[PDB]
Amino acid sequence: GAPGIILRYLQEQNRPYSAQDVFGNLQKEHGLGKAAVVKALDQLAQEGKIKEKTYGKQKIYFAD
């Protein structure tokens, strides 16, 4: 349920976080895998739960 954890996280924070930000922050709190977080981020964006923007070579996600 990484998508649920990440979505809730983004909504509660109300702030944009990078793929690395979300993973790193939820790594110690929940123990989500790197691939799990990244795929869950794309899963949420595909479902239309969150939005995404590409900044250089990195990606940043936020709830909306």
From Swiss-Prot:
Molecular-function annotations in GO: DNA binding; transcription coactivator activity
Listed transmembrane segments: none
GO biological process: one example: reciprocal meiotic recombination
UniProt PTM comment: Phosphorylated by PKA, PKC and MAPK.
Disruption phenotype annotation: Infertility. Males exhibit testicular hypoplasia with lack of spermatozoa. Spermatocytes arrest at the stage of pachytene-like chromosome condensation and spermatogenesis is blocked at prophase of meiosis I. Axial elements are fully developed, but synapsis is limited. While meiotic double-stranded breaks are formed and processed, they fail to be repaired.
Tissue expression: Highly expressed in testis and more specifically in spermatocytes. Detected in spleen, ovary and thymus.
Main localization, broad class: nucleus
Compartmental location: Nucleus
Keywords of this entry: Coiled coil, DNA recombination, DNA-binding, Meiosis, Nucleus
Signal peptide: none
One cellular component term from this protein's GO annotations in UniProt: nucleoplasm
Entry similarity comment: Belongs to the HOP2 family.
Quaternary context: Interacts with the DNA-binding domain of the nuclear receptors NR3C1/GR, ESR2/ER-beta, THRB and RXRA. Forms a stable heterodimer with MND1. Interacts with PSMC3/TBP1.
Role of this protein: Plays an important role in meiotic recombination. Stimulates DMC1-mediated strand exchange required for pairing homologous chromosomes during meiosis. The complex PSMC3IP/MND1 binds DNA, stimulates the recombinase activity of DMC1 as well as DMC1 D-loop formation from double-strand DNA. This complex stabilizes presynaptic RAD51 and DMC1 filaments formed on single strand DNA to capture double-strand DNA. This complex stimulates both synaptic and presynaptic critical steps in RAD51 and DMC1-promoted homologous pairing.
Protein name: Homologous-pairing protein 2 homolog
Gene behind the chain: Psmc3ip
Residues included from the entire protein: 11 to 74 of 217
